[PDB]
Tab-separated table of C-alpha atoms in Angstrom:
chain	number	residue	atom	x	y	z
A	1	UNK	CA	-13.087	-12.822	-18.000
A	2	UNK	CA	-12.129	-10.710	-21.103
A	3	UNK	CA	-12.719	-6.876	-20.087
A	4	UNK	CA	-12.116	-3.683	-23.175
A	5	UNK	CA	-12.719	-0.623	-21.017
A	6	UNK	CA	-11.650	2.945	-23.107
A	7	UNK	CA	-10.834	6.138	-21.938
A	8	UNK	CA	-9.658	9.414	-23.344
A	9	UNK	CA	-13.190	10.574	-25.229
A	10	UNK	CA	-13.930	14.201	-24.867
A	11	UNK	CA	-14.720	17.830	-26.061
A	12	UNK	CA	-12.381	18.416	-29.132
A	13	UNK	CA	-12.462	21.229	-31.470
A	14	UNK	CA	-12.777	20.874	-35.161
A	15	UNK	CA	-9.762	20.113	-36.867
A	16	UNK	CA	-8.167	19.225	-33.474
A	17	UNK	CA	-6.071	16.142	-32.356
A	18	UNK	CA	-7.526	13.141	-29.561
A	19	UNK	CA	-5.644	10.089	-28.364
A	20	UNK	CA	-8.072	7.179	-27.215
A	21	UNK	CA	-6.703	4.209	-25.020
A	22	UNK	CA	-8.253	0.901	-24.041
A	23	UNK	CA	-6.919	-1.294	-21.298
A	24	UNK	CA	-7.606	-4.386	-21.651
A	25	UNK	CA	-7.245	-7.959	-18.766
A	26	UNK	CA	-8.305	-11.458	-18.348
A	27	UNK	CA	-6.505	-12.582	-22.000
A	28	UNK	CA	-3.282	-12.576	-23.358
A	29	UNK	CA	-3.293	-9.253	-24.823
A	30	UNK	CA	-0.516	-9.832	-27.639
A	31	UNK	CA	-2.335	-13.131	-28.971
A	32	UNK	CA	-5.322	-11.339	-30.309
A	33	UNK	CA	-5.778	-8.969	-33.070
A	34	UNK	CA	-7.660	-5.803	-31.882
A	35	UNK	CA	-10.077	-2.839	-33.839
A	36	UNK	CA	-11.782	0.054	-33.300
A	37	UNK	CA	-15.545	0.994	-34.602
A	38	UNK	CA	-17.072	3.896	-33.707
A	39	UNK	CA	-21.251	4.689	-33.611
A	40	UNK	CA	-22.695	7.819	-34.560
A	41	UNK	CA	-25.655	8.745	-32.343
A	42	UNK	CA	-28.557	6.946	-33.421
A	43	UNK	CA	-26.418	5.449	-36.934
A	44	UNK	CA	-24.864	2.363	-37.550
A	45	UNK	CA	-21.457	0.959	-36.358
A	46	UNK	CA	-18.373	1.805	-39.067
A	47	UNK	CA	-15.264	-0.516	-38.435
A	48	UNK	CA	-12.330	1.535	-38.225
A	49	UNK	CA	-9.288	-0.623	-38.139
A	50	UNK	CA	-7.008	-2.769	-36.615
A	51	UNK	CA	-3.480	-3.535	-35.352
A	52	UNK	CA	-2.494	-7.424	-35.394
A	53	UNK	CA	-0.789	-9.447	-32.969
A	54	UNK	CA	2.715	-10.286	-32.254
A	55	UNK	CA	3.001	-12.043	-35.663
A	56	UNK	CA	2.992	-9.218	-37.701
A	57	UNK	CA	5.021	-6.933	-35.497
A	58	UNK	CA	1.961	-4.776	-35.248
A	59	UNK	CA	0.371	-4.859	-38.521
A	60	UNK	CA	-2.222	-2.139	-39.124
A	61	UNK	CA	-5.238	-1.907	-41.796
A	62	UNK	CA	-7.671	1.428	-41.832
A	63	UNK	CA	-10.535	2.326	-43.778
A	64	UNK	CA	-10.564	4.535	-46.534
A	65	UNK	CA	-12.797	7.432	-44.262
A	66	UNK	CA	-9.885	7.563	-41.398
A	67	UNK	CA	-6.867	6.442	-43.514
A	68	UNK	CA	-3.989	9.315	-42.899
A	69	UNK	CA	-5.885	11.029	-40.207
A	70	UNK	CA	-6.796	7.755	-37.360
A	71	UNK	CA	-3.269	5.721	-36.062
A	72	UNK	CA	-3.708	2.836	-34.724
A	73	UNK	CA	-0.942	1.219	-32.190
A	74	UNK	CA	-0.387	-0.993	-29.169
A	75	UNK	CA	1.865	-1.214	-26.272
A	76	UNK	CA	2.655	-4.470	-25.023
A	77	UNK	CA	4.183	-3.765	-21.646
A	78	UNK	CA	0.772	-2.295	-20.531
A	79	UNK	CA	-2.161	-4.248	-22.628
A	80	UNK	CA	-3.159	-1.060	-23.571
A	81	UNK	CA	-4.345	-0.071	-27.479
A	82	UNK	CA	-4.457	3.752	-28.389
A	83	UNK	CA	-5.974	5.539	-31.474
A	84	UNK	CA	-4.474	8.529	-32.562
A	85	UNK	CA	-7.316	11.176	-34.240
A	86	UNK	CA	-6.144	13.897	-36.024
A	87	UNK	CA	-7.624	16.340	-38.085
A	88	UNK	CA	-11.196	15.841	-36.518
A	89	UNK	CA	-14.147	16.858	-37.706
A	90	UNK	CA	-17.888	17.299	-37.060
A	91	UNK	CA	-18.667	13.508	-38.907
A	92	UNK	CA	-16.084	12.259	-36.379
A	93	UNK	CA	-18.692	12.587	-33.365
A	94	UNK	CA	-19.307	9.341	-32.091
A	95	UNK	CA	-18.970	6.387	-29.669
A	96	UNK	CA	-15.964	4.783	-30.013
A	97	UNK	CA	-15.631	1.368	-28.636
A	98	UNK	CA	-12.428	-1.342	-28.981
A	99	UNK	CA	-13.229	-4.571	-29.834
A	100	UNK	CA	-11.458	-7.809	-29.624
A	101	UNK	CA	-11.107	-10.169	-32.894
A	102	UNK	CA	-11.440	-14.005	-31.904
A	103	UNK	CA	-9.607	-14.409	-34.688
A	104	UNK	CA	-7.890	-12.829	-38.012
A	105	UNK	CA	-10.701	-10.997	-39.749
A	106	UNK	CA	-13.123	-12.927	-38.180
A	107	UNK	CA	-15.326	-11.287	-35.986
A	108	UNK	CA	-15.539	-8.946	-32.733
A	109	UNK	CA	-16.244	-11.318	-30.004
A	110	UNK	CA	-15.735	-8.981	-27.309
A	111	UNK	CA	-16.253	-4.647	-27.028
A	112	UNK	CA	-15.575	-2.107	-24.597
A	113	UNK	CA	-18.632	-0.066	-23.482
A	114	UNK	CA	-17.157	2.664	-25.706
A	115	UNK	CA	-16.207	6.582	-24.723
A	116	UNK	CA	-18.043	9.549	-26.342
A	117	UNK	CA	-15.426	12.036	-28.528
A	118	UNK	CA	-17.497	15.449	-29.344
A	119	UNK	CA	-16.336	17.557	-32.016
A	120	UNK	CA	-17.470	21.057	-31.275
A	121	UNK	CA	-16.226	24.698	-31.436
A	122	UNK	CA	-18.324	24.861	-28.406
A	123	UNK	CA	-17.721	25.242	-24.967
A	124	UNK	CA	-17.298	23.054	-21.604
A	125	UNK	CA	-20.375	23.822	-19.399
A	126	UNK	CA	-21.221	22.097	-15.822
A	127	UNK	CA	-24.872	21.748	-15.240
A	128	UNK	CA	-27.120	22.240	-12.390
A	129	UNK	CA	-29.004	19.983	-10.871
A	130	UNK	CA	-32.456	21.451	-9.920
A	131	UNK	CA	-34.780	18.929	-7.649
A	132	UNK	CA	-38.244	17.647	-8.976
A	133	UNK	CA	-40.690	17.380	-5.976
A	134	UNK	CA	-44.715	17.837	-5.988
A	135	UNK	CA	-46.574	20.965	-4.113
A	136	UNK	CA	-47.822	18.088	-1.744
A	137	UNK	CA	-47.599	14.758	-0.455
A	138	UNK	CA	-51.698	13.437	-1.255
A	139	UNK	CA	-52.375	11.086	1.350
A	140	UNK	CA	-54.973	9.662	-1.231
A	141	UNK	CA	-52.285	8.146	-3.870
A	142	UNK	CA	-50.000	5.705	-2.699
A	143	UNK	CA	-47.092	6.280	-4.690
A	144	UNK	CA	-45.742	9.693	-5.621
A	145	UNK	CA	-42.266	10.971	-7.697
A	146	UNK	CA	-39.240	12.693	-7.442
A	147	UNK	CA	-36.625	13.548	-9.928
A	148	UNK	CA	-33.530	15.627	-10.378
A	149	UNK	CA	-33.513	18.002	-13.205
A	150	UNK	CA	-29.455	17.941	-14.575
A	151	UNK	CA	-29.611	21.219	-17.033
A	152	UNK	CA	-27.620	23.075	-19.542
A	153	UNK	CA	-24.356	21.090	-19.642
A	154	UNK	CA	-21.948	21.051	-22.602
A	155	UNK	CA	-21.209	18.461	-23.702
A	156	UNK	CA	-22.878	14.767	-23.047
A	157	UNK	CA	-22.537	12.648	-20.774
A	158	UNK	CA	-23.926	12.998	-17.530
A	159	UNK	CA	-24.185	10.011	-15.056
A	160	UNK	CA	-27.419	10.046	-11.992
A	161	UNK	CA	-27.864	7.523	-9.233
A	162	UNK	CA	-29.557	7.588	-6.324
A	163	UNK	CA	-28.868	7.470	-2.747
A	164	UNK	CA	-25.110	6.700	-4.117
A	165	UNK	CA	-26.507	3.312	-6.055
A	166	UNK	CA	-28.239	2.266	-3.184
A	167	UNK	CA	-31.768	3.300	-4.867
A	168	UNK	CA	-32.110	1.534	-7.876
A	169	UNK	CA	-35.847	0.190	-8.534
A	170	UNK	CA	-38.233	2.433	-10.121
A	171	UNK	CA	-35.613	5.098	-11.745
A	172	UNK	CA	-36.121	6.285	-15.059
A	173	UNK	CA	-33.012	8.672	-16.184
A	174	UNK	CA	-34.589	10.359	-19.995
A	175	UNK	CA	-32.509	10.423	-22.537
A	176	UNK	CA	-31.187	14.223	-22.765
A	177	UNK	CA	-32.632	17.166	-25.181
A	178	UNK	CA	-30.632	19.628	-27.156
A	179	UNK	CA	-31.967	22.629	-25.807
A	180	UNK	CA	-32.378	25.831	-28.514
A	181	UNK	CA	-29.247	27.456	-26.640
A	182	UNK	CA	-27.145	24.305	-27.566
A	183	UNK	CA	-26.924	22.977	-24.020
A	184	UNK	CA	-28.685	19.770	-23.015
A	185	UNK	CA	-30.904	19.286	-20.037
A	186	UNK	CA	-32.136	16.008	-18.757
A	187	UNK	CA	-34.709	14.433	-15.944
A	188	UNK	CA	-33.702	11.247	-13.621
A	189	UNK	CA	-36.971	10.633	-11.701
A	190	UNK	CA	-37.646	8.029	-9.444
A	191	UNK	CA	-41.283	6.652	-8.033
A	192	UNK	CA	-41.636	5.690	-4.056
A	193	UNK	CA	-44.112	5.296	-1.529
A	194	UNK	CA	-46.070	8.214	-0.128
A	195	UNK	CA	-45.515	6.669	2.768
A	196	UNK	CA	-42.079	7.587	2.764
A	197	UNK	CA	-42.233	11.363	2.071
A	198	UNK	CA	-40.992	13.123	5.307
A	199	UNK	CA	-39.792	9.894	6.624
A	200	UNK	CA	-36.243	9.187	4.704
A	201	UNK	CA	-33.845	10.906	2.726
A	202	UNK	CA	-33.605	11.024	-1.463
A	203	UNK	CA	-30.524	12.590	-2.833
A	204	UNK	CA	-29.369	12.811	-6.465
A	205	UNK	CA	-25.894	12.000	-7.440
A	206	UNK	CA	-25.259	13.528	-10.889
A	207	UNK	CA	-21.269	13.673	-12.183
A	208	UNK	CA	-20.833	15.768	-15.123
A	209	UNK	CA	-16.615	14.723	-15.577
A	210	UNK	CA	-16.272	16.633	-18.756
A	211	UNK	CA	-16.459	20.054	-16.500
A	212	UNK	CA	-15.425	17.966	-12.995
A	213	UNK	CA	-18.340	18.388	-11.734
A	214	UNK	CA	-20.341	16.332	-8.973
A	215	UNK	CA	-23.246	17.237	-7.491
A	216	UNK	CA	-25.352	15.521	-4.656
A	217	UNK	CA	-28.711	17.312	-4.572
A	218	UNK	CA	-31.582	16.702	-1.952
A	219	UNK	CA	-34.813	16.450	-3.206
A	220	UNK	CA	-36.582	15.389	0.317
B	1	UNK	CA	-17.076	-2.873	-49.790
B	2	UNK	CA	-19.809	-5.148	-49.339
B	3	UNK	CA	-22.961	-3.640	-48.293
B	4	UNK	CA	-25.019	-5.632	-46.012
B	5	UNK	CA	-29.218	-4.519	-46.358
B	6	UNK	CA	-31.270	-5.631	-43.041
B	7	UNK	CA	-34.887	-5.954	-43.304
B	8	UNK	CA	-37.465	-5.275	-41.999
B	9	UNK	CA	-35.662	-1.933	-40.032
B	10	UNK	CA	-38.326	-2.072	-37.340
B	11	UNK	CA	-40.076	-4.897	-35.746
B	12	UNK	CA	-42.779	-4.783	-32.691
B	13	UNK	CA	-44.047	-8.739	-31.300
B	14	UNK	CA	-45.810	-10.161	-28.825
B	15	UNK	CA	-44.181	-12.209	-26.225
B	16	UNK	CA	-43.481	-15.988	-27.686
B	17	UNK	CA	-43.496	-15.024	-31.256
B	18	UNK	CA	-41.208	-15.434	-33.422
B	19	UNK	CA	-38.787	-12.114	-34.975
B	20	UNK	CA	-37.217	-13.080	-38.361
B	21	UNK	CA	-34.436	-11.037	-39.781
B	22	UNK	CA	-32.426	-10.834	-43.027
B	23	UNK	CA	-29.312	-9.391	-44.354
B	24	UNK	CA	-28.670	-9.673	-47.769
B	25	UNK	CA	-25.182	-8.936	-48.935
B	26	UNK	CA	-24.262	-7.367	-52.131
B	27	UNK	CA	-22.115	-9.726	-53.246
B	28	UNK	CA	-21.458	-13.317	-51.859
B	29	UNK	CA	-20.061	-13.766	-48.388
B	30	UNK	CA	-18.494	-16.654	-46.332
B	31	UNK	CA	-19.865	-16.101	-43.354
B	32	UNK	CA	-22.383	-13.125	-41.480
B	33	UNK	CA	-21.895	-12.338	-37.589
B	34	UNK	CA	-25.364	-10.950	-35.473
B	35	UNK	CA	-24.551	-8.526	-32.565
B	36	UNK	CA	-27.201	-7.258	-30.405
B	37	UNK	CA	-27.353	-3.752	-28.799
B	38	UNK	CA	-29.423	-3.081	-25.619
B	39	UNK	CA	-30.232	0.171	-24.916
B	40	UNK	CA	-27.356	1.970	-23.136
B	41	UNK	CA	-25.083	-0.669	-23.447
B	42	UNK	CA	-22.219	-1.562	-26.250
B	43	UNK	CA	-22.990	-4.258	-28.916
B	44	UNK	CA	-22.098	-8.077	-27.882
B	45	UNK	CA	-21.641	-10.831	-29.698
B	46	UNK	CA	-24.821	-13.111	-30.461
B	47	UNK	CA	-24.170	-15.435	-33.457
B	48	UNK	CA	-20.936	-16.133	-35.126
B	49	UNK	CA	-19.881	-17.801	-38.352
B	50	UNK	CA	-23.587	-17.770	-39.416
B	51	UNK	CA	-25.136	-20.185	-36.986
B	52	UNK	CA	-23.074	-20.298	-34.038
B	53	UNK	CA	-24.492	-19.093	-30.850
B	54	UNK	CA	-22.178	-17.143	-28.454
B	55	UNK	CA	-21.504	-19.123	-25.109
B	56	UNK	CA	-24.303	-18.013	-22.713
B	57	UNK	CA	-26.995	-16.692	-25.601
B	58	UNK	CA	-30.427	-18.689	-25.031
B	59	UNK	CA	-31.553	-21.319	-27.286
B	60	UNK	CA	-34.471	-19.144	-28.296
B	61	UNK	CA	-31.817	-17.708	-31.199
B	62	UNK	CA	-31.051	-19.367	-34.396
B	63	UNK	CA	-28.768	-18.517	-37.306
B	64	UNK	CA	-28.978	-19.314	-40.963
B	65	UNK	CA	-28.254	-18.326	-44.495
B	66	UNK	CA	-25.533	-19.043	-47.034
B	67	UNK	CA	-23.931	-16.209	-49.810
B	68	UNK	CA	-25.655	-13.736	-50.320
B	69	UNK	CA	-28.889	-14.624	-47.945
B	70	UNK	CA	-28.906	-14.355	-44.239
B	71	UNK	CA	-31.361	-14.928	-41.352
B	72	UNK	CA	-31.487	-14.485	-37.606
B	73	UNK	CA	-34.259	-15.819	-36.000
B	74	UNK	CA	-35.810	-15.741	-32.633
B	75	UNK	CA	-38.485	-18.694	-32.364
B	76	UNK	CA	-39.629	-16.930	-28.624
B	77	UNK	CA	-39.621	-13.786	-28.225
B	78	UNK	CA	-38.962	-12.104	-24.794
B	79	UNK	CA	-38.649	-8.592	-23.057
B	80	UNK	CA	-35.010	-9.069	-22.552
B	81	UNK	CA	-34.599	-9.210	-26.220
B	82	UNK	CA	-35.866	-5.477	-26.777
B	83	UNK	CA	-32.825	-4.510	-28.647
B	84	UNK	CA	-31.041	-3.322	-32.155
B	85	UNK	CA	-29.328	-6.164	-33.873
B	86	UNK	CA	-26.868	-5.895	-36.611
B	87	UNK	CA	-25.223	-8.434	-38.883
B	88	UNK	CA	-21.901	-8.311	-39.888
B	89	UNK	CA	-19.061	-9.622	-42.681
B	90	UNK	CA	-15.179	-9.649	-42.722
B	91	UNK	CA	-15.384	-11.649	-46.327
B	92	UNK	CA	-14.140	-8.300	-47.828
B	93	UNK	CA	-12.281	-5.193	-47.070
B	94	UNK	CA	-13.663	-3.388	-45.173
B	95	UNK	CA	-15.965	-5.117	-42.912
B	96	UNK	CA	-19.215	-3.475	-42.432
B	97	UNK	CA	-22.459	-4.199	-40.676
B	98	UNK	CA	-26.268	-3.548	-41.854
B	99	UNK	CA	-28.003	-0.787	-40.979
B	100	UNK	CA	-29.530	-2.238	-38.091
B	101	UNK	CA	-32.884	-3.643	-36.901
B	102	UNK	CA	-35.017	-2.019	-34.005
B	103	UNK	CA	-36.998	-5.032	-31.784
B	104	UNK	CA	-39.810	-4.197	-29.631
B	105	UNK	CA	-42.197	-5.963	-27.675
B	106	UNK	CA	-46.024	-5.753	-27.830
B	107	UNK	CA	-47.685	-6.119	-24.159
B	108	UNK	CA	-51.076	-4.965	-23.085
B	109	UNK	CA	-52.139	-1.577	-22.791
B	110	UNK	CA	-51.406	0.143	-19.854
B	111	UNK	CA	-52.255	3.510	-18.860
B	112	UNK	CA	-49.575	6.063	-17.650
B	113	UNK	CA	-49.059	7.630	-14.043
B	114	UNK	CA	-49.110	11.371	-14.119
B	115	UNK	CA	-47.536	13.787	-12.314
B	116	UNK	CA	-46.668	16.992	-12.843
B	117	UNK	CA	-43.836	19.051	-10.819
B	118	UNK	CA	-42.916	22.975	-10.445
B	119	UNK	CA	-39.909	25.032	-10.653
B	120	UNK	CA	-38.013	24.980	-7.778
B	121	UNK	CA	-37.006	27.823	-5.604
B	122	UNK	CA	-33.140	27.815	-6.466
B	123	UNK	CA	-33.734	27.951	-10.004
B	124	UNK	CA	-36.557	30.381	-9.805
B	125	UNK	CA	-33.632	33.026	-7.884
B	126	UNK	CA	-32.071	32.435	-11.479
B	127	UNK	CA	-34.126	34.300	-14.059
B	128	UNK	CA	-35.717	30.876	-15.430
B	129	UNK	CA	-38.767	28.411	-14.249
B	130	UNK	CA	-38.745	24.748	-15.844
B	131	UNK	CA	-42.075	23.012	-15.446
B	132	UNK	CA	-42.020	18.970	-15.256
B	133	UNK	CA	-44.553	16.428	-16.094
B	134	UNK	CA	-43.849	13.044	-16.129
B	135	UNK	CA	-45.939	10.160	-18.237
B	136	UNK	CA	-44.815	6.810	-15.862
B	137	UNK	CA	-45.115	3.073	-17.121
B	138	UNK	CA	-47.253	3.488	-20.306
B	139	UNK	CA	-47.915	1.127	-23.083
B	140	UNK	CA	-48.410	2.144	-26.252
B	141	UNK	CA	-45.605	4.970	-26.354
B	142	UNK	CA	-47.655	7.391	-28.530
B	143	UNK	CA	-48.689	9.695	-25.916
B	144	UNK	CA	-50.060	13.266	-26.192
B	145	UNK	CA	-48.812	15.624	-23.816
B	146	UNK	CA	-50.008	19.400	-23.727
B	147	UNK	CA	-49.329	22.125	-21.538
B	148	UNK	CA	-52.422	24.612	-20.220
B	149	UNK	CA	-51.122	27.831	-18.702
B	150	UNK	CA	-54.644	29.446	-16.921
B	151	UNK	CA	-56.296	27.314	-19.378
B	152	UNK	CA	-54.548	28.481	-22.262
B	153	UNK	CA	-52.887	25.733	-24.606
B	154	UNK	CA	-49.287	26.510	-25.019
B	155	UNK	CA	-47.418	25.060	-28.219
B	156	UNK	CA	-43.662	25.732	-29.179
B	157	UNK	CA	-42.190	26.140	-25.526
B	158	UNK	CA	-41.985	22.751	-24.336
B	159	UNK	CA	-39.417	19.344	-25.266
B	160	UNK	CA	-40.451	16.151	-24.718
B	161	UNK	CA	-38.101	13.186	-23.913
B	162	UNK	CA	-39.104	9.187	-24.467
B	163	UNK	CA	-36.985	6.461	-22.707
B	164	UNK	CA	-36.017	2.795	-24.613
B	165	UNK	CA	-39.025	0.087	-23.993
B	166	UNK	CA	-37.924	-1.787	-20.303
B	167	UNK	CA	-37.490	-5.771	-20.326
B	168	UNK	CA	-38.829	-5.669	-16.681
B	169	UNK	CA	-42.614	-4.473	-17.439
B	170	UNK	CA	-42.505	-3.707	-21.214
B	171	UNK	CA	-43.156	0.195	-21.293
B	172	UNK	CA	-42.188	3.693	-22.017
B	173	UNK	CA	-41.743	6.593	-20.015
B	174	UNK	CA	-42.169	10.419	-20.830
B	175	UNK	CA	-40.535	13.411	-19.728
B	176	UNK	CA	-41.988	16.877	-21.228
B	177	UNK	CA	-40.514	20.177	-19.891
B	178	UNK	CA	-42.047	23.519	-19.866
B	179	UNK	CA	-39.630	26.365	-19.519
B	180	UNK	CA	-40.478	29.773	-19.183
B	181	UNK	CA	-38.777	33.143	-17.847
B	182	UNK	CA	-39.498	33.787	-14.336
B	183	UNK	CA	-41.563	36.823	-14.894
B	184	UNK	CA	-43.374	35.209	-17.573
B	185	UNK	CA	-44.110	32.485	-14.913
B	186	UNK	CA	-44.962	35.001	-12.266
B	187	UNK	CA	-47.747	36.097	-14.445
B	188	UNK	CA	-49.740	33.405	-14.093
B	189	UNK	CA	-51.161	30.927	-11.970
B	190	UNK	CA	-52.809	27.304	-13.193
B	191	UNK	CA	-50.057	25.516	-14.589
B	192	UNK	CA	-51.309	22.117	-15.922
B	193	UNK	CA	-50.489	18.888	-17.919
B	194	UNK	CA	-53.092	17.652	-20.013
B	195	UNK	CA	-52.402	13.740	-21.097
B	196	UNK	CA	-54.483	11.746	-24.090
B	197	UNK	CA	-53.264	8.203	-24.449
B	198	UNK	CA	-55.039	4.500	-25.151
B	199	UNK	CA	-54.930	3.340	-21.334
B	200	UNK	CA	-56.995	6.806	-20.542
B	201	UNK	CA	-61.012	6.550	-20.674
B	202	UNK	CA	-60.552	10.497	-21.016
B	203	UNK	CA	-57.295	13.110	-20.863
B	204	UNK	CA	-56.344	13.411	-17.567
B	205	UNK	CA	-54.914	16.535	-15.833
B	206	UNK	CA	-52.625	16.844	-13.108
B	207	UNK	CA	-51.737	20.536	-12.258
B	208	UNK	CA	-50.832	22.920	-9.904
B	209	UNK	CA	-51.028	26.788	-8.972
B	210	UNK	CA	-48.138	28.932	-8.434
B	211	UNK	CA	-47.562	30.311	-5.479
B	212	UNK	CA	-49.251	27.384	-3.689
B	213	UNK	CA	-46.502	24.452	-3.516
């Protein structure tokens, strides 16, 4: 089984420097030519390059946007591809994902699930998780909500489970809002049986690693 | 660099019908690859060298075209497909993808599940009071949400928050949050969320007053 996963995507201020890495397993690493595109929040995907395999030595290509700023290189010994970003810039927000080329500049057959880089002058921010319960059970409805409410953290992402995974059916996390002050704020509710209220436990687990923080907040 | 156009950008089908999508290239290309991106998750590969279907991809999609015409076809369409699909070239330098085409699916309408929830105590010790209602399992999305503060219609001091259509039942969900200072909040009592959508005979309101929960 072919598995991309990246790492390294964070807070970086403009004009700054960021490495990327992506470990990759289950292929022979050196036989396969790999790239890097990145996604802008709600744009398109923009290929950004690639480094070929052992026969080329490590031959790169870039596109005119990164050329002289993005490096591209690969290290063997660990399966591991990097991208060096210099110079960033606000444009250079994105998603960046690896991808693997089934061939020579034929076409991504496999992708990492991609890490976030943010290029901000502003600052690191944990959030705090606030619980979303109702004034009262209501014996009349059958089925009532609870929710964790993750807000103003700087910057994205934000991961919520429930019960540590174990809770899974009827959880909605929203996407998060840009609050006015420049810090977002988002909702993970989940729906259960009134029938349950009082009975067992709902807790929030909501990891923020960009500020190391983890929070497991009780909502009943 | 060869610009790839998709059309159309936005498509919204029943179950079993079909979704037909084109990419036309600027210039002539060998071949045009079709990824598909599910909410939350990274692109994967759906059709390659024009009509080849990734292993594991359902016989429900199709690929065709030749030059400067391409088209991606799905003959049945199903929830699982909800999903952004691009089509891609590597026939010059460099390779780009088309804008991107937004699939939704068209289900029955069904009403939303209301609730509405107050600030809590440790955020209220703070200095600030967010206010919570939630729009559950609704189909259409457009949904009208508006917040009454002792009957008084509030505009400007609330942000609303839409999740991506679900494969499993076909509908939306809505977060809209009310935040006010605490002593603004403390000067009040009725706080309540007024909701207007297609599954609703008539707006319903779920509320609550403060000082009461």
């Amino acid at each position: 089984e072919v598995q991309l996963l990246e790492s390294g995507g964070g807070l970086v201020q403009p004009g700054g420097s960021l490495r990327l890495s992506c470990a990759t397993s289950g292929f022979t690493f050196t036989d396969y030519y790999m790239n890097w595109v990145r996604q802008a929040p709600g744009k398109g995907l923009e290929w950004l390059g690639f480094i070929g395999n052992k026969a080329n030595g490590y031959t790169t290509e870039y596109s005119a946007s990164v050329k002289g700023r993005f490096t591209i290189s690969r290290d063997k010994s660990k399966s591991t591809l990097y991208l060096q970003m210099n110079t960033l810039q606000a444009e250079d927000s994105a998603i960046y994902y690896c991808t693997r080329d089934r061939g020579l500049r034929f076409y991504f057959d496999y992708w990492g699930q991609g890490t976030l880089v943010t290029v901000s002058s502003a600052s690191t921010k944990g959030p705090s998780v606030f619980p979303l319960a109702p004034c009262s059970r209501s014996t009349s409805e059958s089925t009532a909500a609870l929710g964790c409410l993750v807000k103003d953290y700087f910057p994205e992402p934000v991961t919520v489970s429930w019960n540590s995974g174990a809770l899974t059916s009827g959880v909605h996390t929203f996407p998060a809002v840009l609050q006015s002050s420049g810090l977002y704020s988002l909702s993970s509710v989940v729906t259960v049986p009134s029938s349950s209220l009082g009975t067992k436990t709902y807790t929030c687990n909501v990891d923020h690693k960009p500020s190391n923080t983890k929070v497991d907040k009780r909502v009943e | 660099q060869t610009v790839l156009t998709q059309s159309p950008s936005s498509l919204s089908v029943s179950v079993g019908d079909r979704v037909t999508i084109t990419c036309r290239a600027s210039s002539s290309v060998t071949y045009i690859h079709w990824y598909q991106q599910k909410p939350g998750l990274a692109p994967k590969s759906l059709i390659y060298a024009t009509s080849n279907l990734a292993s594991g991809v359902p016989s429900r999609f199709s690929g065709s075209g030749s030059g400067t015409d391409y088209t991606f076809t799905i003959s049945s369409l199903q929830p699982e497909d909800i999903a952004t699909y691009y089509c891609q070239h590597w026939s010059s330098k460099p390779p780009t993808f088309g804008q991107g085409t937004k699939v939704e699916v068209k289900r029955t309408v069904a009403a939303p599940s209301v609730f509405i929830f107050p600030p809590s105590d440790e955020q209220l010790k703070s200095g600030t009071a967010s206010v919570v209602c939630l729009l559950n399992n609704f189909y259409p999305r457009e949904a009208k949400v508006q917040w009454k503060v002792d009957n008084a219609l509030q505009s400007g001091n609330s942000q609303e928050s839409v999740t991506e259509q679900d494969s499993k039942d076909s509908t939306y969900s809505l977060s809209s949050t009310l935040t006010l200072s605490k002593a603004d909040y403390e000067k009040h009592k009725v706080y309540a969320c007024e909701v207007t959508h297609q599954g609703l005979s008539s707006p319903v309101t779920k509320s609550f007053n403060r000082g009461e929960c």
